[PDB]
Amino acid sequence: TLQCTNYAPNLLSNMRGELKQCSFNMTTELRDKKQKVYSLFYRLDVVQ
Amino acid sequence: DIIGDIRMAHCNVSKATWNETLGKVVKQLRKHFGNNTIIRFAQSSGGD
Amino acid sequence: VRPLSVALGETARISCGRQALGSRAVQWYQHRPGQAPILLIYNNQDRPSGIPERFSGTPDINFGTRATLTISGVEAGDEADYYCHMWDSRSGFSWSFGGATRLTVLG
Amino acid sequence: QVQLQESGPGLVKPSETLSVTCSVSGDSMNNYYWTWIRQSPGKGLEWIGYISDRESATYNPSLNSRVVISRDTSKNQLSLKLNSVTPADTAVYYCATARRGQRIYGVVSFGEFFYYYSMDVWGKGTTVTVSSA
Ligand SMILES: *[C@@H]1O[C@H](CO)[C@@H](O[C@@H]2O[C@H](CO)[C@@H](O[C@@H]3O[C@H](CO[C@H]4O[C@H](CO)[C@@H](O)[C@H](O)[C@@H]4O)[C@@H](O)[C@H](O[C@H]4O[C@H](CO)[C@@H](O)[C@H](O)[C@@H]4O[C@H]4O[C@H](CO)[C@@H](O)[C@H](O)[C@@H]4O)[C@@H]3O)[C@H](O)[C@H]2NC(C)=O)[C@H](O)[C@H]1NC(C)=O
Ligand SMILES: *[C@@H]1O[C@H](CO)[C@@H](O[C@@H]2O[C@H](CO)[C@@H](O)[C@H](O)[C@H]2NC(C)=O)[C@H](O)[C@H]1NC(C)=O
Ligand SMILES: *[C@@H]1O[C@H](CO)[C@@H](O)[C@H](O)[C@H]1NC(C)=O
Ligand SMILES: *[C@@H]1O[C@H](CO)[C@@H](O)[C@H](O)[C@H]1NC(C)=O
Ligand SMILES: *[C@@H]1O[C@H](CO)[C@@H](O)[C@H](O)[C@H]1NC(C)=O
């Protein structure tokens, strides 16, 4: 599950609805430890 | 992330030589449809 | 509100503490206490008529540099507080000005 | 050439209406944009709002829309109105003009630009204080 919001707010150009900034968890090499990460995605690959 | 300026990817094409190319290809196309028939181009229809 | 002190004669280099991000387009004002604010530099290179050629900012080419104001030939009246009004492409419409850097010439 | 001169009541008790005008002399207000500046002691400068030929009273959202912009081209004046005022706004006010410059940095067909306002001609300013006593 991705917790995610819009990146680059209050922008008045054409490119607004793209560039969402999400955050998720992911396992590391130790299977008992987990990891937090920040990343970006375009609009056409995420769905609420 | 983004270092710099949010922009939008695009493509250019030289205007005059594209028009001349379309004017050439419609001259070759008229050999199957008499001399005077209205030829019109249009956008795509649908699909993915 | 922050101070700075430069002795007589030599140059002085002031830069505003807001981190610029994008294409820069800044202004520099000057406000003596009690008097009226005057403009010094607009559009990072230009200059209105009536200002001597001892005031020079930074040309905004090849992104990655800090905007700063350099003055040369300092004198006694150069005591007023300065301002770095800032505009970019990303941060949208601004409203504030920022903290004034107080110049205190000595000699 | 544009010259500025102010007019204010000076000493008004709080929870009232504060109206301060600036007089425009020398030229008209056909293309010039008009702003207002507040300078309170114990802090830096502060910018209030502006207006243009389309008469957009655009306000600072840190001011709770307690102020009203008023222009007059029939008799060449500008007017402020301040409603539901505080005792904590004793400050010299300023009526200065501003021009609009654009800066385009990508393509023009995508709206890939922004606007900036530069304030070149300034007023001498007048002091207006509020006091419960
Ligand atoms: C596909 O085809 C499109 C066709 O539209 C093409 O778009 C063009 O893209 C370029 C790249 O962004 C745009 O170029 C900009 O041009 C403006 C124009 O300003 C002056 O220039 C001309 C004459 O040169 C005048 O006619 C005009 O009225 C203006 O006087 C420039 O302002 C831009 O440069 C500034 O910003 C850059 C980034 O910040 C800086 O690198 C640059 O140096 C300038 O910054 C500062 O430089 C000056 C140096 O002294 C300084 O004094 C200034 O104050 C300034 O702040 C930028 O070059 C162009 O406008 C687009 N065309 C249109 C119609 O919009 C695509 O590039 C093309 N793509 C491909 C891949 O082919
Ligand atoms: C990472 O997984 C954790 C595991 O549930 C998620 O958040 C936790 O939520 C509980 C209850 O709200 C908190 O007490 C924990 O502190 C949270 N932990 C973390 C690491 O956030 C969380 O949704 C996941 N993180 C992301 C970014 O997806
Ligand atoms: C496209 O890029 C080439 C790269 O060599 C350049 O010569 C040309 O002027 C550009 N523009 C057009 C319209 O072909
Ligand atoms: C395209 O090229 C023709 C040349 O046959 C010219 O007459 C015309 O003005 C050009 N432009 C358009 C939009 O048809
Ligand atoms: C169309 O017109 C051309 C004019 O050069 C003529 O030679 C040709 O025979 C015509 N074709 C038809 C199918 O009418």
Side-chain angles (χ1 to χ4, degrees), chain C residues 23-25 27 29 31 34-39 42-44 60 83 85 87-89 93-95 97, chain D residues 37 39 44-50 58-61 94 103 105 114-120 122-123:
Chain C
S23 295
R24 289 181 289 110
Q27 279 71 240
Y29 291 102
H31 179 74
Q35 283 79 14
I38 60 171
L39 191 147
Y42 68 100
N43 202 356
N44 307 323
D60 49 358
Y83 289 97
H85 190 194
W87 296 92
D88 60 349
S89 178
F93 186 77
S94 176
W95 290 95
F97 294 101
Chain D
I37 300 298
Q39 180 180 2
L45 295 176
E46 186 178 2
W47 178 50
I48 300 167
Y50 67 98
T58 302
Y59 297 102
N60 192 3
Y94 295 97
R103 182 185 179 186
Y105 62 96
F114 62 95
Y115 287 164
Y116 60 93
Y117 292 159
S118 295
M119 299 175 185
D120 55 355
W122 290 81

Short mmCIF file of all heavy atoms in Angstrom, two decimals, chain C residues 23-25 27 29 31 34-39 42-44 60 83 85 87-89 93-95 97, chain D residues 37 39 44-50 58-61 94 103 105 114-120 122-123:
data_model
loop_
_atom_site.label_atom_id
_atom_site.label_comp_id
_atom_site.label_asym_id
_atom_site.label_seq_id
_atom_site.Cartn_x
_atom_site.Cartn_y
_atom_site.Cartn_z
N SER C 23 15.05 29.10 -11.85
CA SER C 23 15.52 30.31 -12.51
C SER C 23 15.32 31.51 -11.59
O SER C 23 14.21 31.79 -11.13
CB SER C 23 14.79 30.51 -13.82
OG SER C 23 15.09 29.47 -14.73
N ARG C 24 16.40 32.22 -11.34
CA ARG C 24 16.40 33.30 -10.36
C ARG C 24 15.99 34.60 -11.02
O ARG C 24 16.37 34.89 -12.16
CB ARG C 24 17.77 33.48 -9.73
CG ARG C 24 18.17 32.37 -8.79
CD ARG C 24 19.52 32.65 -8.19
NE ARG C 24 20.57 32.49 -9.18
CZ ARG C 24 21.27 33.49 -9.69
NH1 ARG C 24 21.01 34.73 -9.31
NH2 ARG C 24 22.21 33.26 -10.59
N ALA C 25 15.20 35.38 -10.30
CA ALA C 25 14.85 36.73 -10.73
C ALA C 25 14.63 37.54 -9.47
O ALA C 25 13.53 37.53 -8.91
CB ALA C 25 13.62 36.72 -11.61
N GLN C 27 15.33 41.05 -6.76
CA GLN C 27 15.46 42.50 -6.65
C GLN C 27 16.27 42.83 -5.41
O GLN C 27 16.34 42.03 -4.48
CB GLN C 27 14.11 43.20 -6.59
CG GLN C 27 13.45 43.40 -7.94
CD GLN C 27 12.94 42.11 -8.52
OE1 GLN C 27 13.36 41.71 -9.60
NE2 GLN C 27 12.06 41.45 -7.80
N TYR C 29 16.61 46.08 -2.71
CA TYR C 29 16.13 47.37 -2.26
C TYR C 29 17.09 47.95 -1.23
O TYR C 29 18.04 47.29 -0.80
CB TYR C 29 14.72 47.25 -1.72
CG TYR C 29 13.69 46.94 -2.77
CD1 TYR C 29 13.20 45.66 -2.93
CD2 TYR C 29 13.21 47.95 -3.59
CE1 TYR C 29 12.25 45.38 -3.88
CE2 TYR C 29 12.26 47.68 -4.55
CZ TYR C 29 11.78 46.39 -4.69
OH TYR C 29 10.83 46.12 -5.65
N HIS C 31 16.74 50.63 2.28
CA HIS C 31 15.82 51.38 3.13
C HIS C 31 16.59 52.02 4.28
O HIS C 31 16.90 51.36 5.27
CB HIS C 31 14.70 50.50 3.66
CG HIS C 31 13.75 51.23 4.55
ND1 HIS C 31 12.82 52.12 4.06
CD2 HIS C 31 13.60 51.23 5.89
CE1 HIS C 31 12.12 52.63 5.06
NE2 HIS C 31 12.58 52.10 6.18
N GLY C 34 13.50 55.88 8.18
CA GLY C 34 12.79 57.14 8.08
C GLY C 34 12.59 57.59 6.65
O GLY C 34 11.58 58.23 6.33
N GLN C 35 13.54 57.27 5.78
CA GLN C 35 13.47 57.66 4.38
C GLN C 35 12.63 56.64 3.60
O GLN C 35 11.98 55.76 4.17
CB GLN C 35 14.87 57.79 3.79
CG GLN C 35 15.60 59.06 4.18
CD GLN C 35 16.20 59.01 5.57
OE1 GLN C 35 16.30 57.94 6.17
NE2 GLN C 35 16.60 60.16 6.08
N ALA C 36 12.65 56.76 2.28
CA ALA C 36 11.86 55.90 1.42
C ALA C 36 12.71 54.79 0.82
O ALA C 36 13.90 55.00 0.56
CB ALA C 36 11.23 56.72 0.29
N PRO C 37 12.12 53.61 0.62
CA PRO C 37 12.86 52.52 -0.03
C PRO C 37 13.16 52.85 -1.48
O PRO C 37 12.30 53.33 -2.22
CB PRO C 37 11.89 51.34 0.07
CG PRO C 37 11.00 51.67 1.19
CD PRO C 37 10.82 53.15 1.14
N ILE C 38 14.40 52.63 -1.88
CA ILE C 38 14.83 52.84 -3.25
C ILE C 38 15.19 51.50 -3.87
O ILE C 38 15.62 50.57 -3.18
CB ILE C 38 16.00 53.84 -3.33
CG1 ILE C 38 17.21 53.33 -2.54
CG2 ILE C 38 15.57 55.18 -2.78
CD1 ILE C 38 18.46 54.15 -2.76
N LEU C 39 14.99 51.40 -5.17
CA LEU C 39 15.36 50.19 -5.89
C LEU C 39 16.81 50.29 -6.34
O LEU C 39 17.30 51.37 -6.67
CB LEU C 39 14.44 49.98 -7.08
CG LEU C 39 14.45 48.66 -7.86
CD1 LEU C 39 13.05 48.40 -8.35
CD2 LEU C 39 15.40 48.68 -9.05
N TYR C 42 17.29 45.14 -10.58
CA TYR C 42 16.16 44.31 -10.96
C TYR C 42 16.56 43.44 -12.13
O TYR C 42 17.42 43.83 -12.93
CB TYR C 42 14.92 45.15 -11.31
CG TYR C 42 15.06 45.95 -12.58
CD1 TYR C 42 14.50 45.51 -13.77
CD2 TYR C 42 15.69 47.18 -12.57
CE1 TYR C 42 14.61 46.25 -14.92
CE2 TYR C 42 15.81 47.93 -13.72
CZ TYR C 42 15.26 47.46 -14.89
OH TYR C 42 15.37 48.19 -16.04
N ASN C 43 15.95 42.25 -12.21
CA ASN C 43 16.16 41.24 -13.25
C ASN C 43 17.63 40.82 -13.35
O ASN C 43 18.14 40.57 -14.44
CB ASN C 43 15.64 41.73 -14.61
CG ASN C 43 15.35 40.59 -15.58
OD1 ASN C 43 15.60 39.43 -15.28
ND2 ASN C 43 14.79 40.93 -16.73
N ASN C 44 18.33 40.85 -12.21
CA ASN C 44 19.62 40.23 -11.93
C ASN C 44 20.80 40.88 -12.64
O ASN C 44 21.96 40.59 -12.32
CB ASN C 44 19.57 38.74 -12.29
CG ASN C 44 18.42 38.03 -11.64
OD1 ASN C 44 18.05 38.32 -10.51
ND2 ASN C 44 17.82 37.09 -12.36
N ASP C 60 22.47 35.36 -14.18
CA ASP C 60 21.79 34.11 -13.83
C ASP C 60 21.92 33.05 -14.92
O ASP C 60 20.93 32.54 -15.45
CB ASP C 60 20.34 34.41 -13.51
CG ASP C 60 19.67 35.26 -14.57
OD1 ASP C 60 20.36 35.65 -15.53
OD2 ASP C 60 18.47 35.56 -14.43
N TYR C 83 17.55 44.27 1.37
CA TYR C 83 16.53 43.25 1.23
C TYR C 83 16.77 42.49 -0.06
O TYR C 83 17.23 43.05 -1.06
CB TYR C 83 15.13 43.85 1.23
CG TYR C 83 14.70 44.39 2.57
CD1 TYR C 83 14.81 45.73 2.87
CD2 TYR C 83 14.18 43.54 3.54
CE1 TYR C 83 14.42 46.23 4.09
CE2 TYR C 83 13.77 44.02 4.76
CZ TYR C 83 13.90 45.37 5.03
OH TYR C 83 13.50 45.86 6.25
N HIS C 85 14.42 40.46 -2.26
CA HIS C 85 13.14 39.94 -2.71
C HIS C 85 13.40 38.93 -3.81
O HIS C 85 14.16 39.20 -4.74
CB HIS C 85 12.25 41.07 -3.20
CG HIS C 85 10.84 40.65 -3.46
ND1 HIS C 85 9.95 41.44 -4.16
CD2 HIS C 85 10.16 39.54 -3.10
CE1 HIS C 85 8.78 40.82 -4.22
NE2 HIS C 85 8.89 39.67 -3.59
N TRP C 87 12.18 35.56 -6.45
CA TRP C 87 11.16 34.90 -7.24
C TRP C 87 11.79 33.75 -8.00
O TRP C 87 12.96 33.84 -8.38
CB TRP C 87 10.52 35.87 -8.23
CG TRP C 87 9.77 37.00 -7.62
CD1 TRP C 87 10.26 38.23 -7.33
CD2 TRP C 87 8.39 37.03 -7.27
NE1 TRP C 87 9.28 39.02 -6.80
CE2 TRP C 87 8.11 38.31 -6.76
CE3 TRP C 87 7.35 36.10 -7.34
CZ2 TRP C 87 6.86 38.68 -6.31
CZ3 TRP C 87 6.10 36.47 -6.89
CH2 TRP C 87 5.86 37.75 -6.39
N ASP C 88 11.03 32.70 -8.24
CA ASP C 88 11.54 31.54 -8.97
C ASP C 88 10.44 31.00 -9.87
O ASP C 88 9.44 31.67 -10.15
CB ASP C 88 12.07 30.45 -8.03
CG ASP C 88 11.02 29.92 -7.08
OD1 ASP C 88 9.92 30.51 -6.96
OD2 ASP C 88 11.29 28.89 -6.44
N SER C 89 10.62 29.77 -10.33
CA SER C 89 9.60 29.04 -11.06
C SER C 89 8.85 28.04 -10.19
O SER C 89 7.67 27.78 -10.44
CB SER C 89 10.23 28.30 -12.24
OG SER C 89 9.25 27.55 -12.94
N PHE C 93 3.84 32.06 -6.11
CA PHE C 93 3.73 33.48 -5.81
C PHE C 93 4.19 33.76 -4.39
O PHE C 93 3.69 33.17 -3.44
CB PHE C 93 2.29 33.93 -6.00
CG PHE C 93 2.10 35.40 -5.85
CD1 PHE C 93 2.47 36.26 -6.87
CD2 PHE C 93 1.55 35.93 -4.69
CE1 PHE C 93 2.30 37.62 -6.74
CE2 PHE C 93 1.38 37.29 -4.57
CZ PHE C 93 1.75 38.13 -5.59
N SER C 94 5.15 34.67 -4.26
CA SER C 94 5.69 35.03 -2.96
C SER C 94 4.94 36.21 -2.37
O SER C 94 4.23 36.93 -3.08
CB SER C 94 7.18 35.38 -3.05
OG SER C 94 7.65 35.81 -1.79
N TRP C 95 5.08 36.39 -1.08
CA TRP C 95 4.52 37.56 -0.41
C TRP C 95 5.53 38.31 0.44
O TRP C 95 5.49 39.53 0.49
CB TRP C 95 3.33 37.15 0.47
CG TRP C 95 2.13 36.72 -0.29
CD1 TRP C 95 1.78 35.45 -0.61
CD2 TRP C 95 1.10 37.56 -0.80
NE1 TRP C 95 0.60 35.44 -1.30
CE2 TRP C 95 0.15 36.73 -1.43
CE3 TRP C 95 0.88 38.95 -0.79
CZ2 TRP C 95 -0.99 37.23 -2.04
CZ3 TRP C 95 -0.26 39.43 -1.41
CH2 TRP C 95 -1.17 38.58 -2.02
N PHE C 97 9.43 39.39 2.17
CA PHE C 97 10.70 39.93 1.68
C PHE C 97 11.89 39.15 2.23
O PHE C 97 12.73 38.67 1.46
CB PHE C 97 10.82 41.41 2.06
CG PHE C 97 9.83 42.28 1.37
CD1 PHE C 97 8.70 42.72 2.03
CD2 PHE C 97 10.03 42.67 0.05
CE1 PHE C 97 7.78 43.53 1.39
CE2 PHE C 97 9.12 43.48 -0.59
CZ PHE C 97 7.99 43.91 0.08
N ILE D 37 2.45 49.09 1.43
CA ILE D 37 3.53 48.56 2.25
C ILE D 37 3.32 48.98 3.69
O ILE D 37 3.10 50.16 3.97
CB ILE D 37 4.90 49.05 1.75
CG1 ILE D 37 5.15 48.61 0.31
CG2 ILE D 37 6.02 48.53 2.63
CD1 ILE D 37 5.19 47.12 0.15
N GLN D 39 5.20 48.97 7.45
CA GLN D 39 6.45 48.82 8.19
C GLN D 39 6.20 49.06 9.66
O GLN D 39 6.07 50.21 10.09
CB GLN D 39 7.53 49.78 7.68
CG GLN D 39 8.85 49.65 8.42
CD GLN D 39 9.91 50.60 7.92
OE1 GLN D 39 9.66 51.41 7.02
NE2 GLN D 39 11.10 50.52 8.49
N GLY D 44 10.64 43.43 10.21
CA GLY D 44 11.00 43.90 8.89
C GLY D 44 9.82 44.49 8.15
O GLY D 44 8.79 44.86 8.73
N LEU D 45 9.98 44.59 6.83
CA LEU D 45 8.92 45.13 6.00
C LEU D 45 7.81 44.10 5.81
O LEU D 45 7.96 42.92 6.13
CB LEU D 45 9.47 45.54 4.64
CG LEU D 45 10.48 46.69 4.68
CD1 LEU D 45 11.03 46.96 3.30
CD2 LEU D 45 9.82 47.92 5.25
N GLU D 46 6.69 44.56 5.28
CA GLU D 46 5.56 43.68 5.03
C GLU D 46 4.74 44.24 3.88
O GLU D 46 4.43 45.43 3.83
CB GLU D 46 4.69 43.53 6.28
CG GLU D 46 3.57 42.52 6.13
CD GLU D 46 2.77 42.35 7.40
OE1 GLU D 46 3.07 43.06 8.38
OE2 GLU D 46 1.85 41.51 7.43
N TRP D 47 4.39 43.36 2.95
CA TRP D 47 3.65 43.72 1.75
C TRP D 47 2.21 43.26 1.90
O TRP D 47 1.95 42.18 2.43
CB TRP D 47 4.31 43.11 0.52
CG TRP D 47 3.61 43.38 -0.74
CD1 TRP D 47 3.18 44.58 -1.20
CD2 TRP D 47 3.32 42.43 -1.77
NE1 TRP D 47 2.59 44.44 -2.42
CE2 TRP D 47 2.68 43.13 -2.81
CE3 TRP D 47 3.54 41.06 -1.91
CZ2 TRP D 47 2.25 42.51 -3.96
CZ3 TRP D 47 3.11 40.44 -3.06
CH2 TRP D 47 2.47 41.16 -4.07
N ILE D 48 1.28 44.08 1.43
CA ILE D 48 -0.12 43.93 1.80
C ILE D 48 -0.93 43.35 0.65
O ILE D 48 -1.49 42.26 0.76
CB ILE D 48 -0.71 45.28 2.24
CG1 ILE D 48 0.05 45.81 3.46
CG2 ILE D 48 -2.17 45.14 2.57
CD1 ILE D 48 -0.23 47.25 3.77
N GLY D 49 -0.99 44.08 -0.46
CA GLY D 49 -1.78 43.64 -1.59
C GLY D 49 -1.58 44.58 -2.75
O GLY D 49 -0.75 45.50 -2.70
N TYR D 50 -2.36 44.36 -3.80
CA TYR D 50 -2.22 45.18 -4.99
C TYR D 50 -3.55 45.24 -5.72
O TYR D 50 -4.53 44.62 -5.32
CB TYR D 50 -1.12 44.64 -5.91
CG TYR D 50 -1.41 43.30 -6.54
CD1 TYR D 50 -1.92 43.21 -7.83
CD2 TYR D 50 -1.14 42.13 -5.85
CE1 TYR D 50 -2.18 41.98 -8.40
CE2 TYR D 50 -1.40 40.90 -6.42
CZ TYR D 50 -1.92 40.83 -7.69
OH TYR D 50 -2.17 39.61 -8.26
N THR D 58 -6.33 41.59 -4.65
CA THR D 58 -5.69 40.35 -4.23
C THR D 58 -5.02 40.59 -2.88
O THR D 58 -4.18 41.48 -2.74
CB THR D 58 -4.67 39.89 -5.26
OG1 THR D 58 -5.32 39.70 -6.52
CG2 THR D 58 -4.06 38.57 -4.83
N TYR D 59 -5.39 39.79 -1.89
CA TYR D 59 -4.96 40.01 -0.52
C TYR D 59 -3.98 38.95 -0.06
O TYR D 59 -4.00 37.80 -0.52
CB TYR D 59 -6.17 40.04 0.41
CG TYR D 59 -7.10 41.17 0.12
CD1 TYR D 59 -8.28 40.95 -0.58
CD2 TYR D 59 -6.81 42.46 0.53
CE1 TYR D 59 -9.14 41.99 -0.86
CE2 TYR D 59 -7.67 43.50 0.26
CZ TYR D 59 -8.83 43.27 -0.43
OH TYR D 59 -9.68 44.31 -0.70
N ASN D 60 -3.10 39.35 0.85
CA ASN D 60 -2.24 38.42 1.55
C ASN D 60 -3.10 37.51 2.42
O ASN D 60 -3.84 38.00 3.28
CB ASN D 60 -1.24 39.18 2.41
CG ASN D 60 -0.13 38.30 2.95
OD1 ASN D 60 -0.05 37.11 2.64
ND2 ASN D 60 0.73 38.88 3.77
N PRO D 61 -3.02 36.19 2.25
CA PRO D 61 -3.80 35.28 3.10
C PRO D 61 -3.34 35.20 4.54
O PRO D 61 -3.96 34.49 5.33
CB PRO D 61 -3.63 33.92 2.40
CG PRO D 61 -2.39 34.06 1.59
CD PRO D 61 -2.36 35.48 1.14
N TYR D 94 2.70 53.00 3.23
CA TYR D 94 3.36 53.45 2.01
C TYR D 94 2.49 53.15 0.80
O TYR D 94 1.95 52.05 0.67
CB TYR D 94 4.71 52.78 1.84
CG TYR D 94 5.71 53.16 2.90
CD1 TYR D 94 5.91 52.35 4.01
CD2 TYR D 94 6.43 54.34 2.81
CE1 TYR D 94 6.82 52.69 4.98
CE2 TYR D 94 7.35 54.69 3.78
CZ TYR D 94 7.53 53.86 4.86
OH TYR D 94 8.44 54.20 5.83
N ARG D 103 8.77 36.61 -17.33
CA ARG D 103 10.01 35.90 -17.63
C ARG D 103 9.68 34.52 -18.14
O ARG D 103 9.20 33.68 -17.38
CB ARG D 103 10.91 35.78 -16.42
CG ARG D 103 12.18 35.09 -16.77
CD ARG D 103 13.02 34.84 -15.58
NE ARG D 103 14.24 34.16 -15.95
CZ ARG D 103 15.12 33.70 -15.08
NH1 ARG D 103 14.89 33.84 -13.79
NH2 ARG D 103 16.21 33.08 -15.50
N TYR D 105 10.95 30.96 -19.71
CA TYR D 105 12.15 30.16 -19.58
C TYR D 105 12.09 28.84 -20.31
O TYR D 105 13.13 28.20 -20.49
CB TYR D 105 12.46 29.88 -18.10
CG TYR D 105 11.40 29.09 -17.37
CD1 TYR D 105 11.52 27.72 -17.22
CD2 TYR D 105 10.31 29.72 -16.79
CE1 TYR D 105 10.56 26.99 -16.54
CE2 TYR D 105 9.35 29.00 -16.11
CZ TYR D 105 9.48 27.64 -15.99
OH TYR D 105 8.52 26.94 -15.31
N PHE D 114 6.19 32.69 -15.43
CA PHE D 114 5.57 33.27 -14.25
C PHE D 114 5.71 34.78 -14.34
O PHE D 114 6.34 35.32 -15.26
CB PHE D 114 6.19 32.71 -12.96
CG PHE D 114 7.64 33.02 -12.81
CD1 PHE D 114 8.06 34.11 -12.07
CD2 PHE D 114 8.60 32.19 -13.36
CE1 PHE D 114 9.40 34.38 -11.91
CE2 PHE D 114 9.93 32.46 -13.21
CZ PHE D 114 10.34 33.55 -12.49
N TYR D 115 5.13 35.48 -13.37
CA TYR D 115 5.16 36.93 -13.32
C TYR D 115 5.90 37.39 -12.07
O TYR D 115 5.99 36.66 -11.08
CB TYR D 115 3.75 37.52 -13.33
CG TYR D 115 3.06 37.43 -14.67
CD1 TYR D 115 1.68 37.60 -14.76
CD2 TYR D 115 3.77 37.18 -15.83
CE1 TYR D 115 1.04 37.52 -15.98
CE2 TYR D 115 3.13 37.10 -17.05
CZ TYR D 115 1.77 37.27 -17.12
OH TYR D 115 1.14 37.19 -18.33
N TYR D 116 6.42 38.61 -12.13
CA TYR D 116 7.06 39.23 -10.99
C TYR D 116 6.74 40.71 -10.99
O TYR D 116 6.58 41.33 -12.05
CB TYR D 116 8.58 39.01 -10.99
CG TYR D 116 9.29 39.55 -12.21
CD1 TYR D 116 9.84 40.82 -12.21
CD2 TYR D 116 9.44 38.77 -13.34
CE1 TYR D 116 10.50 41.31 -13.32
CE2 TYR D 116 10.10 39.25 -14.46
CZ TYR D 116 10.62 40.52 -14.44
OH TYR D 116 11.28 41.00 -15.54
N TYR D 117 6.65 41.29 -9.80
CA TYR D 117 6.28 42.68 -9.63
C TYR D 117 7.47 43.43 -9.05
O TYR D 117 8.03 43.02 -8.03
CB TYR D 117 5.07 42.81 -8.70
CG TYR D 117 3.78 42.28 -9.28
CD1 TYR D 117 2.73 41.93 -8.45
CD2 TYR D 117 3.61 42.12 -10.65
CE1 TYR D 117 1.54 41.44 -8.96
CE2 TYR D 117 2.43 41.64 -11.17
CZ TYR D 117 1.40 41.30 -10.32
OH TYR D 117 0.22 40.82 -10.82
N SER D 118 7.85 44.53 -9.70
CA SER D 118 8.97 45.34 -9.25
C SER D 118 8.47 46.74 -8.92
O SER D 118 7.71 47.34 -9.68
CB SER D 118 10.06 45.41 -10.31
OG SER D 118 10.62 44.13 -10.53
N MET D 119 8.90 47.26 -7.78
CA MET D 119 8.35 48.47 -7.18
C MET D 119 9.41 49.55 -7.22
O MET D 119 10.29 49.62 -6.36
CB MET D 119 7.90 48.17 -5.76
CG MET D 119 6.82 47.10 -5.71
SD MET D 119 6.34 46.62 -4.05
CE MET D 119 5.21 45.28 -4.43
N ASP D 120 9.33 50.42 -8.23
CA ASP D 120 10.41 51.37 -8.50
C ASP D 120 10.17 52.75 -7.87
O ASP D 120 11.07 53.33 -7.27
CB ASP D 120 10.63 51.49 -10.01
CG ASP D 120 9.37 51.86 -10.77
OD1 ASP D 120 8.29 51.93 -10.15
OD2 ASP D 120 9.47 52.08 -11.99
N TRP D 122 8.40 55.15 -5.15
CA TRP D 122 7.96 54.96 -3.78
C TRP D 122 7.45 56.27 -3.20
O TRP D 122 7.69 57.35 -3.74
CB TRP D 122 9.11 54.42 -2.94
CG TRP D 122 9.45 53.02 -3.28
CD1 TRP D 122 10.21 52.60 -4.33
CD2 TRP D 122 9.11 51.85 -2.54
NE1 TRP D 122 10.32 51.23 -4.31
CE2 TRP D 122 9.66 50.75 -3.21
CE3 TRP D 122 8.38 51.63 -1.37
CZ2 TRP D 122 9.50 49.45 -2.77
CZ3 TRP D 122 8.22 50.33 -0.93
CH2 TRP D 122 8.78 49.26 -1.63
N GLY D 123 6.73 56.15 -2.08
CA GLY D 123 6.21 57.30 -1.38
C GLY D 123 7.03 57.62 -0.13
O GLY D 123 7.82 56.81 0.36
#
